[PDB]
Structure 1
Amino acid sequence: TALVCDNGSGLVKAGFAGDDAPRAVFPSIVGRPRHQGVMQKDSYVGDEAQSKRGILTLKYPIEHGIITNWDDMEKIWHHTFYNELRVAPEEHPTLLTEAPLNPKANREKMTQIMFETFNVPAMYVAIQAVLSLYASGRTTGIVLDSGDGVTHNVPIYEGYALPHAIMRLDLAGRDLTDYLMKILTERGYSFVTTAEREIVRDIKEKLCYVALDFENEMATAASSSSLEKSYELPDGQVITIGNERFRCPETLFQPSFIGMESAGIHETTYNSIMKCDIDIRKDLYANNVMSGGTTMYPGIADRMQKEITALAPSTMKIKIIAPPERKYSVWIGGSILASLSTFQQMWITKQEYDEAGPSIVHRKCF
Protein backbone atom coordinates (compact mmCIF):
# COMPACT_ATOMS: atom_id res chain seq x y z
CA THR A 1 0.00 0.00 0.00
CA ALA A 2 1.08 3.58 -0.68
CA LEU A 3 1.98 6.24 1.87
CA VAL A 4 0.28 9.63 1.65
CA CYS A 5 2.32 12.35 3.37
CA ASP A 6 1.01 15.92 3.30
CA ASN A 7 3.90 18.03 4.64
CA GLY A 8 2.44 21.44 5.36
CA SER A 9 4.04 24.54 6.81
CA GLY A 10 2.22 23.85 10.07
CA LEU A 11 1.04 20.25 10.31
CA VAL A 12 2.20 16.88 9.00
CA LYS A 13 -0.68 14.74 7.71
CA ALA A 14 0.51 11.19 7.10
CA GLY A 15 -1.23 7.89 6.56
CA PHE A 16 -1.96 5.07 4.14
CA ALA A 17 -3.72 5.29 0.80
CA GLY A 18 -7.27 3.95 1.06
CA ASP A 19 -7.98 5.22 4.56
CA ASP A 20 -10.47 8.03 5.12
CA ALA A 21 -8.35 10.09 7.54
CA PRO A 22 -4.64 10.64 8.21
CA ARG A 23 -3.23 8.27 10.80
CA ALA A 24 -0.56 10.71 12.04
CA VAL A 25 -1.29 14.42 12.48
CA PHE A 26 1.33 16.38 14.41
CA PRO A 27 2.95 19.83 14.24
CA SER A 28 5.81 20.27 11.78
CA ILE A 29 8.19 21.55 14.45
CA VAL A 30 11.66 20.70 15.71
CA GLY A 31 12.43 21.73 19.29
CA ARG A 32 15.87 22.09 20.83
CA PRO A 33 16.70 22.84 24.48
CA ARG A 34 17.63 26.46 25.14
CA HIS A 35 18.69 25.98 28.78
CA GLN A 36 21.37 23.99 30.62
CA GLY A 37 20.80 20.30 31.29
CA VAL A 38 21.83 19.30 34.80
CA MET A 39 20.22 15.88 35.39
CA GLN A 40 18.04 14.61 27.78
CA LYS A 41 17.68 14.23 24.03
CA ASP A 42 19.20 16.73 21.61
CA SER A 43 16.04 17.50 19.62
CA TYR A 44 12.31 16.86 19.79
CA VAL A 45 9.86 16.58 16.91
CA GLY A 46 6.13 17.08 16.63
CA ASP A 47 3.90 16.41 19.62
CA GLU A 48 6.91 15.52 21.77
CA ALA A 49 8.34 18.98 21.08
CA GLN A 50 4.92 20.48 21.81
CA SER A 51 4.67 18.91 25.28
CA LYS A 52 8.16 20.06 26.32
CA ARG A 53 8.05 23.45 24.58
CA GLY A 54 8.57 25.30 27.87
CA ILE A 55 12.31 24.56 27.73
CA LEU A 56 12.66 24.35 23.94
CA THR A 57 13.16 26.73 21.06
CA LEU A 58 10.60 25.69 18.44
CA LYS A 59 11.46 26.05 14.75
CA TYR A 60 9.37 25.30 11.67
CA PRO A 61 11.49 23.88 8.82
CA ILE A 62 8.85 24.85 6.23
CA GLU A 63 8.21 28.57 5.69
CA HIS A 64 5.50 29.62 3.25
CA GLY A 65 5.38 26.18 1.69
CA ILE A 66 9.13 26.20 1.06
CA ILE A 67 11.48 23.87 2.94
CA THR A 68 14.16 25.82 4.75
CA ASN A 69 16.55 23.87 6.97
CA TRP A 70 16.78 20.52 5.18
CA ASP A 71 18.33 18.87 8.25
CA ASP A 72 15.24 19.56 10.36
CA MET A 73 12.89 18.51 7.56
CA GLU A 74 14.71 15.18 7.34
CA LYS A 75 14.17 14.66 11.08
CA ILE A 76 10.44 15.24 10.61
CA TRP A 77 10.26 12.72 7.77
CA HIS A 78 12.24 10.25 9.88
CA HIS A 79 9.92 10.89 12.82
CA THR A 80 6.94 10.36 10.50
CA PHE A 81 8.01 7.00 9.05
CA TYR A 82 9.51 5.31 12.10
CA ASN A 83 7.72 6.87 15.10
CA GLU A 84 4.25 7.78 13.77
CA LEU A 85 3.43 5.34 10.97
CA ARG A 86 5.97 2.70 12.10
CA VAL A 87 6.69 1.46 8.58
CA ALA A 88 9.76 0.78 6.49
CA PRO A 89 10.00 3.54 3.84
CA GLU A 90 11.66 1.17 1.35
CA GLU A 91 8.47 -0.91 1.00
CA HIS A 92 5.79 1.66 0.15
CA PRO A 93 5.49 4.19 -2.68
CA THR A 94 5.11 7.65 -1.18
CA LEU A 95 2.74 10.35 -2.44
CA LEU A 96 3.92 13.85 -1.50
CA THR A 97 2.31 17.26 -1.92
CA GLU A 98 3.60 20.73 -2.72
CA ALA A 99 2.19 24.22 -3.05
CA PRO A 100 1.97 25.61 -6.59
CA LEU A 101 4.48 28.17 -7.85
CA ASN A 102 7.17 26.77 -5.55
CA PRO A 103 10.90 26.91 -6.33
CA LYS A 104 12.01 24.09 -8.61
CA ALA A 105 14.84 23.10 -6.25
CA ASN A 106 12.36 22.44 -3.42
CA ARG A 107 10.80 19.48 -5.23
CA GLU A 108 14.13 18.20 -6.59
CA LYS A 109 15.75 18.18 -3.14
CA MET A 110 12.88 16.30 -1.49
CA THR A 111 12.90 13.73 -4.30
CA GLN A 112 16.63 13.14 -3.83
CA ILE A 113 16.12 12.65 -0.09
CA MET A 114 13.20 10.26 -0.54
CA PHE A 115 15.15 8.12 -3.02
CA GLU A 116 18.64 8.23 -1.51
CA THR A 117 18.04 8.60 2.25
CA PHE A 118 14.78 6.69 2.83
CA ASN A 119 15.12 4.55 -0.34
CA VAL A 120 11.44 4.60 -1.28
CA PRO A 121 10.60 2.38 -4.28
CA ALA A 122 8.47 5.02 -6.02
CA MET A 123 7.17 8.50 -5.31
CA TYR A 124 5.03 11.26 -6.75
CA VAL A 125 4.60 14.95 -5.90
CA ALA A 126 0.96 15.85 -6.43
CA ILE A 127 -0.78 19.20 -6.90
CA GLN A 128 -2.51 20.14 -3.66
CA ALA A 129 -5.49 21.84 -5.30
CA VAL A 130 -6.08 18.83 -7.54
CA LEU A 131 -6.18 16.65 -4.42
CA SER A 132 -8.72 18.95 -2.74
CA LEU A 133 -10.95 18.53 -5.79
CA TYR A 134 -10.61 14.74 -5.58
CA ALA A 135 -11.71 14.95 -1.94
CA SER A 136 -14.90 16.82 -2.83
CA GLY A 137 -15.69 14.38 -5.65
CA ARG A 138 -15.55 17.15 -8.26
CA THR A 139 -13.83 17.63 -11.59
CA THR A 140 -14.66 21.35 -11.93
CA GLY A 141 -14.12 24.16 -9.47
CA ILE A 142 -11.82 26.85 -8.17
CA VAL A 143 -10.02 25.70 -5.03
CA LEU A 144 -9.22 28.18 -2.26
CA ASP A 145 -6.53 26.39 -0.25
CA SER A 146 -5.28 28.20 2.86
CA GLY A 147 -3.06 26.46 5.39
CA ASP A 148 -0.33 27.66 7.73
CA GLY A 149 2.05 29.09 5.14
CA VAL A 150 0.38 29.45 1.73
CA THR A 151 -2.97 30.62 0.41
CA HIS A 152 -3.57 29.83 -3.25
CA ASN A 153 -6.38 29.70 -5.81
CA VAL A 154 -6.35 27.08 -8.56
CA PRO A 155 -9.21 26.94 -11.09
CA ILE A 156 -9.93 23.55 -12.64
CA TYR A 157 -12.54 22.89 -15.34
CA GLU A 158 -13.57 19.38 -16.42
CA GLY A 159 -10.25 18.01 -15.19
CA TYR A 160 -8.12 20.63 -16.98
CA ALA A 161 -6.12 23.08 -14.90
CA LEU A 162 -5.67 26.70 -15.97
CA PRO A 163 -2.15 27.46 -14.68
CA HIS A 164 -2.09 31.06 -15.90
CA ALA A 165 -5.01 31.86 -13.56
CA ILE A 166 -3.30 30.40 -10.47
CA MET A 167 -2.93 32.90 -7.63
CA ARG A 168 -0.54 32.40 -4.72
CA LEU A 169 -0.49 34.41 -1.50
CA ASP A 170 2.16 34.09 1.21
CA LEU A 171 -0.45 35.06 3.81
CA ALA A 172 -1.92 32.19 5.81
CA GLY A 173 -2.41 30.85 9.32
CA ARG A 174 1.04 31.63 10.69
CA ASP A 175 0.74 35.28 9.65
CA LEU A 176 -2.65 35.45 11.38
CA THR A 177 -1.07 34.03 14.54
CA ASP A 178 1.67 36.67 14.43
CA TYR A 179 -0.91 39.42 13.93
CA LEU A 180 -2.95 38.12 16.87
CA MET A 181 0.19 38.27 19.03
CA LYS A 182 0.64 41.90 18.01
CA ILE A 183 -2.92 43.03 18.76
CA LEU A 184 -3.00 41.12 22.05
CA THR A 185 -0.45 43.63 23.39
CA GLU A 186 -3.22 46.25 23.21
CA ARG A 187 -4.78 44.52 26.24
CA GLY A 188 -1.45 44.10 28.02
CA TYR A 189 -0.90 40.44 27.08
CA SER A 190 2.71 39.81 26.04
CA PHE A 191 3.48 36.67 24.04
CA VAL A 192 7.05 36.65 22.74
CA THR A 193 8.75 33.25 22.74
CA THR A 194 8.20 30.52 20.17
CA ALA A 195 6.44 28.50 22.87
CA GLU A 196 4.03 31.36 23.56
CA ARG A 197 3.32 31.60 19.83
CA GLU A 198 1.92 28.07 20.11
CA ILE A 199 -0.38 29.35 22.87
CA VAL A 200 -1.62 32.20 20.67
CA ARG A 201 -2.30 29.72 17.86
CA ASP A 202 -4.51 27.76 20.26
CA ILE A 203 -6.35 30.96 21.18
CA LYS A 204 -6.87 31.68 17.48
CA GLU A 205 -8.27 28.22 16.70
CA LYS A 206 -10.76 28.38 19.60
CA LEU A 207 -11.97 31.99 19.81
CA CYS A 208 -11.44 33.65 16.42
CA TYR A 209 -14.22 33.92 13.86
CA VAL A 210 -14.95 35.84 10.66
CA ALA A 211 -17.39 38.73 10.94
CA LEU A 212 -20.07 38.91 8.27
CA ASP A 213 -19.80 42.72 8.28
CA PHE A 214 -16.57 43.97 9.83
CA GLU A 215 -17.49 47.61 10.50
CA ASN A 216 -20.78 46.66 12.17
CA GLU A 217 -19.01 44.15 14.42
CA MET A 218 -16.47 46.80 15.45
CA ALA A 219 -19.38 49.01 16.53
CA THR A 220 -20.98 46.13 18.44
CA ALA A 221 -17.73 45.23 20.20
CA ALA A 222 -17.25 48.87 21.26
CA SER A 223 -20.78 49.27 22.66
CA SER A 224 -21.05 46.19 24.91
CA SER A 225 -19.21 43.05 26.06
CA SER A 226 -21.32 40.36 24.37
CA LEU A 227 -18.36 39.46 22.13
CA GLU A 228 -15.90 39.06 25.02
CA LYS A 229 -14.59 35.54 25.56
CA SER A 230 -12.23 34.29 28.24
CA TYR A 231 -9.35 31.86 27.81
CA GLU A 232 -7.28 30.10 30.47
CA LEU A 233 -3.54 30.08 29.82
CA PRO A 234 -1.48 26.97 30.67
CA ASP A 235 -0.46 28.54 34.01
CA GLY A 236 -4.02 29.29 35.15
CA GLN A 237 -4.08 32.93 34.08
CA VAL A 238 -7.33 33.95 32.37
CA ILE A 239 -7.24 36.46 29.52
CA THR A 240 -10.23 38.17 27.90
CA ILE A 241 -10.38 39.21 24.24
CA GLY A 242 -13.06 41.19 22.45
CA ASN A 243 -12.76 42.54 18.92
CA GLU A 244 -9.46 40.68 18.46
CA ARG A 245 -11.60 37.58 17.88
CA PHE A 246 -12.67 38.85 14.46
CA ARG A 247 -9.89 41.36 13.76
CA CYS A 248 -7.37 38.53 13.36
CA PRO A 249 -9.26 36.59 10.61
CA GLU A 250 -10.22 39.90 8.95
CA THR A 251 -6.60 40.11 7.74
CA LEU A 252 -7.51 37.43 5.18
CA PHE A 253 -9.91 39.93 3.60
CA GLN A 254 -7.84 43.07 4.33
CA PRO A 255 -4.14 42.14 4.07
CA SER A 256 -3.24 45.79 4.73
CA PHE A 257 -3.68 45.06 8.45
CA ILE A 258 -0.25 43.39 8.33
CA GLY A 259 1.27 45.78 5.79
CA MET A 260 0.67 43.58 2.74
CA GLU A 261 -0.38 45.23 -0.51
CA SER A 262 -2.24 42.27 -2.02
CA ALA A 263 -6.01 42.00 -2.17
CA GLY A 264 -8.07 39.82 0.14
CA ILE A 265 -8.94 36.21 -0.55
CA HIS A 266 -12.33 37.23 -1.95
CA GLU A 267 -10.89 39.57 -4.58
CA THR A 268 -8.10 37.09 -5.33
CA THR A 269 -10.70 34.38 -6.00
CA TYR A 270 -12.71 36.77 -8.18
CA ASN A 271 -9.60 37.93 -10.05
CA SER A 272 -8.67 34.29 -10.67
CA ILE A 273 -12.12 33.58 -12.12
CA MET A 274 -11.94 36.70 -14.31
CA LYS A 275 -8.67 35.46 -15.84
CA CYS A 276 -10.39 32.25 -16.92
CA ASP A 277 -12.29 31.91 -20.19
CA ILE A 278 -15.70 33.56 -20.06
CA ASP A 279 -17.41 30.26 -20.91
CA ILE A 280 -16.18 28.49 -17.74
CA ARG A 281 -16.78 31.29 -15.23
CA LYS A 282 -20.37 30.27 -14.49
CA ASP A 283 -19.26 26.79 -13.41
CA LEU A 284 -16.41 28.24 -11.34
CA TYR A 285 -18.79 30.62 -9.54
CA ALA A 286 -20.88 27.62 -8.45
CA ASN A 287 -17.93 25.49 -7.27
CA ASN A 288 -15.79 27.55 -4.89
CA VAL A 289 -14.13 24.77 -2.88
CA MET A 290 -12.46 25.62 0.43
CA SER A 291 -9.66 23.54 1.93
CA GLY A 292 -7.01 23.89 4.60
CA GLY A 293 -7.03 24.74 8.28
CA THR A 294 -7.26 28.49 7.73
CA THR A 295 -10.69 28.03 6.11
CA MET A 296 -12.01 26.55 9.37
CA TYR A 297 -12.93 29.91 10.92
CA PRO A 298 -16.63 30.16 11.81
CA GLY A 299 -18.37 32.39 9.30
CA ILE A 300 -15.70 32.42 6.60
CA ALA A 301 -17.91 30.64 4.05
CA ASP A 302 -20.77 33.09 4.61
CA ARG A 303 -18.36 36.02 4.36
CA MET A 304 -16.79 34.71 1.14
CA GLN A 305 -20.25 34.12 -0.32
CA LYS A 306 -21.23 37.71 0.49
CA GLU A 307 -18.00 39.24 -0.83
CA ILE A 308 -17.95 37.34 -4.13
CA THR A 309 -21.67 37.97 -4.67
CA ALA A 310 -20.90 41.70 -4.48
CA LEU A 311 -18.15 41.34 -7.12
CA ALA A 312 -19.84 38.92 -9.53
CA PRO A 313 -22.82 39.74 -11.77
CA SER A 314 -26.21 39.44 -10.11
CA THR A 315 -27.39 36.57 -12.34
CA MET A 316 -24.53 34.30 -11.22
CA LYS A 317 -25.11 31.66 -8.55
CA ILE A 318 -22.24 31.88 -6.05
CA LYS A 319 -21.83 28.63 -4.11
CA ILE A 320 -19.07 28.11 -1.55
CA ILE A 321 -18.32 24.43 -0.93
CA ALA A 322 -16.96 24.07 2.63
CA PRO A 323 -17.17 20.46 3.81
CA PRO A 324 -16.63 19.80 7.53
CA GLU A 325 -13.54 17.66 6.81
CA ARG A 326 -11.87 20.31 4.62
CA LYS A 327 -8.93 20.66 7.02
CA TYR A 328 -7.68 17.31 5.65
CA SER A 329 -8.94 17.69 2.07
CA VAL A 330 -5.45 17.53 0.56
CA TRP A 331 -4.62 14.30 2.39
CA ILE A 332 -8.04 12.78 1.70
CA GLY A 333 -7.71 13.57 -2.00
CA GLY A 334 -4.20 12.14 -2.02
CA SER A 335 -5.51 8.94 -0.44
CA ILE A 336 -8.13 8.74 -3.20
CA LEU A 337 -5.63 9.46 -5.97
CA ALA A 338 -3.01 6.98 -4.75
CA SER A 339 -5.71 4.28 -4.74
CA LEU A 340 -6.86 4.81 -8.34
CA SER A 341 -5.90 2.13 -10.85
CA THR A 342 -5.20 4.72 -13.57
CA PHE A 343 -2.65 6.40 -11.28
CA GLN A 344 -0.36 3.37 -10.83
CA GLN A 345 1.44 4.41 -14.04
CA MET A 346 2.25 7.89 -12.67
CA TRP A 347 4.67 6.67 -9.98
CA ILE A 348 8.26 7.79 -10.49
CA THR A 349 10.20 4.65 -9.64
CA LYS A 350 13.78 4.58 -8.40
CA GLN A 351 14.89 3.13 -11.74
CA GLU A 352 13.37 5.95 -13.80
CA TYR A 353 15.00 8.48 -11.46
CA ASP A 354 18.52 7.08 -11.83
CA GLU A 355 18.49 7.49 -15.62
CA ALA A 356 16.26 10.52 -16.25
CA GLY A 357 17.62 12.56 -13.35
CA PRO A 358 15.97 15.31 -11.30
CA SER A 359 14.15 16.63 -14.39
CA ILE A 360 11.64 13.75 -14.32
CA VAL A 361 9.94 15.19 -11.22
CA HIS A 362 8.76 18.38 -12.98
CA ARG A 363 6.07 16.82 -15.20
CA LYS A 364 2.48 18.02 -14.81
CA CYS A 365 3.91 20.63 -12.44
CA PHE A 366 3.19 24.33 -11.98
Structure 2
Amino acid sequence: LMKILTERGYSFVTTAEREIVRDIKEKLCYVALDFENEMATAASSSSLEKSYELPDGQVITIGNERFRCPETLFQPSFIGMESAGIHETTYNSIMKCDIDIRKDLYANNVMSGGTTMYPGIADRMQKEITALAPSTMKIKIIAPPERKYSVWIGGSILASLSTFQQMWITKQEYDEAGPSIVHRKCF
Protein backbone atom coordinates (compact mmCIF):
# COMPACT_ATOMS: atom_id res chain seq x y z
CA LEU A 1 0.00 0.00 0.00
CA MET A 2 2.88 2.37 0.75
CA LYS A 3 4.40 1.57 -2.64
CA ILE A 4 1.14 2.06 -4.55
CA LEU A 5 0.30 5.33 -2.80
CA THR A 6 3.42 6.85 -4.38
CA GLU A 7 1.94 6.52 -7.87
CA ARG A 8 -1.05 8.50 -6.62
CA GLY A 9 1.27 11.26 -5.43
CA TYR A 10 1.32 11.00 -1.65
CA SER A 11 4.65 9.90 -0.18
CA PHE A 12 5.00 7.96 3.07
CA VAL A 13 8.51 7.02 4.14
CA THR A 14 9.33 6.77 7.83
CA THR A 15 7.89 4.47 10.49
CA ALA A 16 5.31 7.00 11.66
CA GLU A 17 4.00 7.26 8.11
CA ARG A 18 3.95 3.46 8.03
CA GLU A 19 1.65 3.46 11.05
CA ILE A 20 -0.44 6.15 9.35
CA VAL A 21 -0.85 4.07 6.19
CA ARG A 22 -1.70 1.06 8.35
CA ASP A 23 -4.45 3.18 9.89
CA ILE A 24 -5.57 4.07 6.35
CA LYS A 25 -5.80 0.40 5.37
CA GLU A 26 -7.55 -0.28 8.69
CA LYS A 27 -10.76 1.36 7.48
CA LEU A 28 -10.43 2.32 3.79
CA CYS A 29 -9.77 -1.08 2.18
CA TYR A 30 -11.73 -4.15 1.15
CA VAL A 31 -11.56 -7.24 -1.06
CA ALA A 32 -13.51 -7.04 -4.31
CA LEU A 33 -15.75 -9.99 -5.14
CA ASP A 34 -14.51 -9.77 -8.73
CA PHE A 35 -11.23 -8.16 -9.78
CA GLU A 36 -11.24 -7.51 -13.53
CA ASN A 37 -14.77 -6.10 -13.56
CA GLU A 38 -14.04 -3.96 -10.50
CA MET A 39 -10.92 -2.51 -12.13
CA ALA A 40 -12.89 -1.89 -15.33
CA THR A 41 -15.67 -0.06 -13.48
CA ALA A 42 -13.12 1.94 -11.49
CA ALA A 43 -12.63 3.95 -14.70
CA SER A 44 -15.96 5.70 -14.01
CA SER A 45 -14.73 6.73 -10.58
CA SER A 46 -18.03 7.49 -8.84
CA SER A 47 -18.74 5.15 -5.91
CA LEU A 48 -15.27 3.64 -5.39
CA GLU A 49 -13.05 6.40 -4.01
CA LYS A 50 -13.72 8.31 -0.81
CA SER A 51 -11.53 10.75 1.06
CA TYR A 52 -9.49 10.07 4.19
CA GLU A 53 -8.37 12.73 6.65
CA LEU A 54 -4.62 12.50 7.16
CA PRO A 55 -3.39 13.41 10.66
CA ASP A 56 -1.87 16.66 9.36
CA GLY A 57 -5.18 17.90 7.90
CA GLN A 58 -4.77 17.48 4.16
CA VAL A 59 -7.16 14.89 2.72
CA ILE A 60 -6.19 11.75 0.84
CA THR A 61 -8.27 10.36 -2.04
CA ILE A 62 -7.62 6.73 -2.98
CA GLY A 63 -9.46 4.95 -5.78
CA ASN A 64 -8.42 1.53 -7.05
CA GLU A 65 -5.81 1.47 -4.27
CA ARG A 66 -8.65 0.54 -1.91
CA PHE A 67 -9.06 -2.97 -3.34
CA ARG A 68 -5.73 -3.37 -5.14
CA CYS A 69 -3.58 -3.77 -2.02
CA PRO A 70 -5.68 -6.62 -0.50
CA GLU A 71 -5.74 -8.33 -3.91
CA THR A 72 -2.09 -9.27 -3.32
CA LEU A 73 -3.33 -12.03 -1.01
CA PHE A 74 -5.00 -13.81 -3.94
CA GLN A 75 -2.32 -12.74 -6.46
CA PRO A 76 1.04 -12.83 -4.64
CA SER A 77 2.86 -12.02 -7.89
CA PHE A 78 2.06 -8.34 -7.29
CA ILE A 79 4.87 -8.10 -4.72
CA GLY A 80 7.03 -10.49 -6.75
CA MET A 81 6.43 -13.90 -5.17
CA GLU A 82 6.21 -17.19 -7.07
CA SER A 83 3.59 -18.48 -4.65
CA ALA A 84 -0.07 -19.35 -4.99
CA GLY A 85 -2.66 -17.15 -3.33
CA ILE A 86 -4.51 -18.05 -0.16
CA HIS A 87 -7.50 -19.29 -2.17
CA GLU A 88 -5.27 -21.76 -4.03
CA THR A 89 -3.05 -22.80 -1.13
CA THR A 90 -6.16 -23.72 0.88
CA TYR A 91 -7.22 -26.07 -1.92
CA ASN A 92 -3.68 -27.45 -2.17
CA SER A 93 -3.57 -28.13 1.58
CA ILE A 94 -6.96 -29.83 1.37
CA MET A 95 -5.76 -32.03 -1.49
CA LYS A 96 -2.62 -32.94 0.47
CA CYS A 97 -4.84 -34.72 3.01
CA ASP A 98 -6.54 -38.11 2.70
CA ILE A 99 -9.34 -38.75 0.23
CA ASP A 100 -12.01 -39.25 2.90
CA ILE A 101 -11.55 -36.26 5.21
CA ARG A 102 -11.59 -33.78 2.31
CA LYS A 103 -15.39 -33.63 2.21
CA ASP A 104 -15.50 -32.60 5.87
CA LEU A 105 -12.69 -30.08 5.36
CA TYR A 106 -14.56 -28.48 2.45
CA ALA A 107 -17.59 -27.60 4.59
CA ASN A 108 -15.53 -26.33 7.55
CA ASN A 109 -13.28 -23.38 6.65
CA VAL A 110 -12.36 -21.43 9.78
CA MET A 111 -11.22 -17.93 8.87
CA SER A 112 -8.96 -16.33 11.47
CA GLY A 113 -6.39 -13.60 11.97
CA GLY A 114 -6.65 -9.84 11.86
CA THR A 115 -5.85 -9.64 8.14
CA THR A 116 -9.08 -11.49 7.29
CA MET A 117 -11.20 -8.59 8.60
CA TYR A 118 -11.40 -7.01 5.14
CA PRO A 119 -15.09 -6.43 4.35
CA GLY A 120 -15.81 -8.87 1.55
CA ILE A 121 -13.02 -11.43 1.89
CA ALA A 122 -15.15 -14.43 2.85
CA ASP A 123 -17.33 -14.12 -0.25
CA ARG A 124 -14.34 -13.94 -2.60
CA MET A 125 -12.61 -16.84 -0.85
CA GLN A 126 -15.75 -18.98 -1.04
CA LYS A 127 -16.21 -18.17 -4.72
CA GLU A 128 -12.59 -19.03 -5.54
CA ILE A 129 -12.62 -22.28 -3.55
CA THR A 130 -15.91 -23.26 -5.18
CA ALA A 131 -14.39 -22.62 -8.61
CA LEU A 132 -11.30 -24.69 -7.80
CA ALA A 133 -13.02 -27.60 -6.04
CA PRO A 134 -15.32 -30.16 -7.67
CA SER A 135 -18.84 -28.85 -8.17
CA THR A 136 -20.67 -31.62 -6.29
CA MET A 137 -20.28 -30.87 -2.58
CA LYS A 138 -20.90 -27.53 -0.92
CA ILE A 139 -18.14 -25.18 0.24
CA LYS A 140 -18.96 -23.42 3.51
CA ILE A 141 -16.74 -20.66 4.90
CA ILE A 142 -16.90 -19.63 8.56
CA ALA A 143 -16.35 -15.94 9.36
CA PRO A 144 -17.25 -15.24 12.99
CA PRO A 145 -17.75 -11.53 13.68
CA GLU A 146 -15.16 -11.70 16.48
CA ARG A 147 -12.54 -13.66 14.50
CA LYS A 148 -10.09 -10.83 15.20
CA TYR A 149 -9.31 -12.28 18.65
CA SER A 150 -10.07 -15.91 17.78
CA VAL A 151 -6.64 -17.19 18.79
CA TRP A 152 -6.91 -15.58 22.22
CA ILE A 153 -10.46 -16.86 22.66
CA GLY A 154 -9.29 -20.39 21.92
CA GLY A 155 -6.32 -20.03 24.24
CA SER A 156 -8.51 -18.85 27.10
CA ILE A 157 -10.95 -21.70 26.46
CA LEU A 158 -8.14 -24.27 26.45
CA ALA A 159 -6.46 -22.88 29.57
CA SER A 160 -9.52 -23.48 31.78
CA LEU A 161 -9.77 -27.22 31.14
CA SER A 162 -9.20 -29.86 33.81
CA THR A 163 -7.06 -32.11 31.60
CA PHE A 164 -4.78 -29.17 30.78
CA GLN A 165 -3.03 -28.88 34.16
CA GLN A 166 -1.22 -32.14 33.40
CA MET A 167 0.07 -30.64 30.13
CA TRP A 168 1.93 -27.69 31.67
CA ILE A 169 5.71 -27.41 31.87
CA THR A 170 6.31 -27.17 35.61
CA LYS A 171 9.23 -25.07 36.80
CA GLN A 172 10.91 -28.04 38.48
CA GLU A 173 10.58 -30.11 35.30
CA TYR A 174 12.23 -27.37 33.25
CA ASP A 175 14.98 -26.93 35.84
CA GLU A 176 15.78 -30.65 35.70
CA ALA A 177 15.31 -31.03 31.93
CA GLY A 178 16.85 -27.94 30.33
CA PRO A 179 15.25 -25.88 27.55
CA SER A 180 14.46 -28.91 25.35
CA ILE A 181 11.46 -29.82 27.51
CA VAL A 182 9.33 -27.54 25.31
CA HIS A 183 10.14 -29.74 22.32
CA ARG A 184 9.63 -32.81 24.51
CA LYS A 185 6.13 -31.80 25.66
CA CYS A 186 4.53 -28.88 23.81
CA PHE A 187 4.86 -30.33 20.30
**Scaled by the length of structure 1, what TM-score is found?**
0.50
Q: Alpha carbons of 1:260 and 1:365: their partners in 2 closer, same or farther (altered >3 Å)?
A: farther
Q: Distance in 2 between matches of 1:365 and 1:270?
A: 28
Post-superposition shift, 1:267? 0.4
Q: Distance in 2 between matches of 1:316 and 1:310?
A: 12
Q: Alpha carbons of 1:301 and 1:193: their partners in 2 closer, same or farther (altered >3 Å)?
A: same
Post-superposition shift, 1:358? 1.3
Post-superposition shift, 1:332? 0.5
Post-superposition shift, 1:329? 0.4
Post-superposition shift, 1:363? 4.0
Which residue among 187, 211, 215 is the counterpart of 2:32? 211
Does residue 1:233 correspond to 2:44, yes or no? no
2:95 aligned residue: 274
Q: Distance in 1 between matches of 2:185 and 2:114?
A: 26
Q: Distance in 2 between matches of 1:307 and 1:289?
A: 16
Does residue 1:321 correspond to 2:142, yes or no? yes
Q: Is the 8 A contact 2:45 2:63 kept in 1?
A: no
SS of 2:184's partner is coil
Q: Alpha carbons of 1:267 and 1:344: their partners in 2 closer, same or farther (altered >3 Å)?
A: same
Q: CA offsets, 1:278-330, max 9 Å, x none?
A: 10000000110011100000110000000000011101210110101101000
**Scaled by the length of structure 2, what TM-score is found?**
0.97
Q: CA offsets, 1:51-78, max 9 Å, x none?
A: xxxxxxxxxxxxxxxxxxxxxxxxxxxx
Q: Distance in 2 between matches of 1:316 and 1:294?
A: 28
Q: What is the RMSD of the two structures over their aligned residues, measured on CA atoms?
A: 1.0
Q: Distance in 1 between matches of 2:128 and 2:186?
A: 31
Q: Is the 8 A contact 1:225 1:242 kept in 2?
A: no
1:21 aligned residue: none
Q: Distance in 1 between matches of 2:97 and 2:36?
A: 32
Post-superposition shift, 1:187? 1.0
Does residue 1:289 correspond to 2:99, yes or no? no
Post-superposition shift, 1:224? 2.6
Higher strand fraction: Structure 1 or Structure 2? Answer: 1
Moved more, 315-324 or 217-226: 217-226
Aligned residues: 187
Q: Distance in 2 between matches of 1:312 and 1:365?
A: 35
Q: CA offsets, 1:106-136, max 9 Å, x none?
A: xxxxxxxxxxxxxxxxxxxxxxxxxxxxxxx
Higher helix fraction: Structure 1 or Structure 2? Answer: 2
Q: Distance in 2 between matches of 1:360 and 1:282?
A: 37
Q: Distance in 2 between matches of 1:299 and 1:346?
A: 39
Structure 1 segments unaligned to the other structure (5+ residues)? 1-179
Q: Alpha carbons of 1:253 and 1:363: their partners in 2 closer, same or farther (altered >3 Å)?
A: farther
Post-superposition shift, 1:199? 0.4
Q: Distance in 1 between matches of 2:156 and 2:39?
A: 43
Post-superposition shift, 1:334? 0.2
Q: Distance in 1 between matches of 2:109 and 2:119?
A: 17
Q: CA offsets, 1:39-95, max 9 Å, x none?
A: xxxxxxxxxxxxxxxxxxxxxxxxxxxxxxxxxxxxxxxxxxxxxxxxxxxxxxxxx
Q: Alpha carbons of 1:249 and 1:238: their partners in 2 closer, same or farther (altered >3 Å)?
A: same
Post-superposition shift, 1:356? 1.3
Q: CA offsets, 1:197-244, max 9 Å, x none?
A: 000001101010000110010011112321011100111110000000
Q: Alpha carbons of 1:335 and 1:220: their partners in 2 closer, same or farther (altered >3 Å)?
A: same
Q: Distance in 1 between matches of 2:90 and 2:106?
A: 10
Post-superposition shift, 1:365? 5.5
- The percentage of aligned residue pairs carrying the same residue is 100
Task: Flag the structure with more relative contact order, 1 or 2, with Cα contacts below 8 A and sequence separation at least 6.
Answer: 1
Q: CA offsets, 1:153-205, max 9 Å, x none?
A: xxxxxxxxxxxxxxxxxxxxxxxxxxx00000111000000000000001101
Structure 2 segments unaligned to the other structure (5+ residues)? none
Post-superposition shift, 1:364? 6.0
Q: Is the 8 A contact 1:289 1:321 kept in 2?
A: yes
